Amino acid sequence: NFCVQIIGGFFTWTPDGIPTLSNITIRIPRGQLTMIVGQVGCGKSSLLLATLGEMQKVSGAVFWNSNLSRGPVAYASQKPWLLNATVEENITFESPFNKQRYKMVIEACSLQPDIDILPHGDQTQIGERGINLSGGQRQRISVARALYQQTNVVFLDDPFSALDVHLSDHLMQAGILELLRDDKRTVVLVTHKLQYLPHADWIIAMKDGTIQREGTLKDFQRSECQLFEH
């Protein structure tokens, strides 16, 4: 059925009661790039965790089915999770190594300057107990790790918010759209970047722990407020 379909959506973090969100009703079928947008702190992370299944639902199970009966779904959430090992092994993350695929990802991630600058290249101990890098560079490695996995569903949180460099984001944005189009996979991104906020693909708005709709960009015109005129 729908890759991201929610019936009740009464997820909560407290084991007993106190629902932090409820009345969630979305249905995202396969091959539907549905980025998630909203205001600051409007339960975007909680909704993303509830979608993965890390939050205790109250109303009931949102139901799931095999993309092409489920539960293994790619997800990254907030903050960079870095493996304290070599950068190259961090990128692969228990995945087969293809030179063309690795070069394609590093081109989209624009990690060539990062590897060249480091004296040991991508063999440096990235993360704790090693070489300390920039926060934006940590996010670029983190987001590229999920993308390189080549899965049918990809969940991302603040890909461009951590680093708003036009050169890095645009190539990553171009790489993300092209890779998703070729693979016909599902992509969900939570970010505050207005560079690609409107798109022909589906968009879902999250506010006050609920989602108004997850549909075409024409709903923004249908909505009373057109994102405050961008």
Automatic annotation (TrEMBL):
ABC transporter domain ranges (all copies): 4-230
Subcellular location(s) of the protein: Cell membrane
Summary of subunit composition and partner proteins: Forms an heterooctamer with KCNJ11; four ABCC8/SUR1 molecules interact with one KCNJ11 homotetramer.
Family from the record: Belongs to the ABC transporter superfamily. ABCC family. Conjugate transporter (TC 3.A.1.208) subfamily.
Function: Regulator subunit of pancreatic ATP-sensitive potassium channel (KATP), playing a major role in the regulation of insulin release. In pancreatic cells, it forms KATP channels with KCNJ11; KCNJ11 forms the channel pore while ABCC8 is required for activation and regulation.
Name of protein: ATP-binding cassette sub-family C member 8
Organism: Mesocricetus auratus (Golden hamster)
